[PDB]
């Protein structure tokens, strides 16, 4: 029942979500956030001038990365505050992190070359990591990560989460939580396991663990899905999806009509996860 | 408490070591 559902790009991946989904996302490159700013060109130049004035009231150097892109180098190790623009369509991103130097400038430079704009409804055919209104073009390895939070107007109290992060996790999902869940199940008769095992989606080898419980007049859920990931892989990073309904204060309206409804939403979203074909 | 356990599972216990460091930044 995917009427009106929208395919979204996050990082290297696509996922389908219902049309009324409320979505929040963060993106991280070599461990630091890359943040969309709505600055126009003169507003960006004014922002940079203000920051330089303030750092003088500590400051070291202003660096041209080329493409109307610039970074400010100060003391925090340095602090490199990079402002980078997408092409062809103008959008500004801030990318700020600590630096112990020539290597970081080169990374900022490559970012300024590689950052491409994308239209709102566009799924790029070129390789790259999608962020807000843009994508970092290429398919050479880089440390990259995102997280997406999602709420659903028709399911109060429900939250869904989708994340990728390069590098293998040190354990798998079933290894990580099975003892914990078993202790829960033997403590609380309202607690059950709905499903435990594997949930592949195409080539993505997801482990899956779905629990639910009833108490205080409410029914809560914690659904978990994880690809452990491989080292230095863009397309099989650590990858997770989760859906939770936790305690809400007063008896509040159910998040779902039944476990089956909850499981159908879950499966429909999870089965839509795939590497973006490029 | 049942919902406290569910909450512990969601906020911390199912998050792997790498994902915990990332969430805490």
Author numbering:
A (entry chain A): 34 to 90, 99 to 117, 124 to 147, 151 to 300, 305 to 332
B (entry chain B): 83 to 107
Sentences reproduced from the published study:
P. aeruginosa encodes three distinct T6SS hemolysin coregulated protein (Hcp) secretion islands (named H1-to H3-T6SS) that act against both prokaryotic and eukaryotic cells. TplE, a novel H2-T6SS-dependent lipase effector, was recently identified. TplE is an antibacterial lipolytic toxin and TplEi interacts with TplE to provide protection from TplE. TplE, a new T6SS trans-kingdom toxin, targets the conserved and essential cell membranes of rival bacteria to cause bacteriolysis, while TplEi functions as a cognate immunity protein to prevent self-intoxication.
Herein, we solved the crystal structure of TplEi in complex with a TplE peptide (residues 82-108) generated by treatment with subtilisin. As anticipated, after 30 days of proteolysis and crystallization, we first observed crystals growing from the subtilisin-treated TplE-TplEi complex sample, and crystals diffracted the X rays to 2.2Å. Surprisingly, the majority of TplEi was intact, whereas TplE had been degraded except for a 27 residue fragment that remained bound to TplEi. Residues 82-108 of TplE is comprised α1 and α2 helices that are connected by a disordered loop region. Because α1 is significantly longer than α2 and the two helices are nearly perpendicular to each other, the peptide exhibits a “L” shape, thus, we designated it as “L” peptide based on its shape. The “L” peptide accommodates a negatively charged groove of domain II of TplEi. Details of the TplE “L” peptide interaction with TplEi involves two salt bridges, eight hydrogen bonds and 147 non-bonded contacts through PDBsum analysis. In particular, “L” peptide residue K100 is anchored in the deep pocket through four hydrogen bonds formed with TplEi residues S215, T216, and G217. The structural superimposition of the “L” peptide and TplE aligned 25 Cα atoms with a rmsd value of 0.59Å, indicating that the conformation of the “L” peptide alone is nearly identical to its conformation in the context of the full protein. The TplE peptide (denoted the “L” peptide) has a high binding affinity for TplEi in vitro and precludes the formation of the TplE-TplEi complex, which in turn releases the toxicity of TplE and thereby induces bacterial cell death.
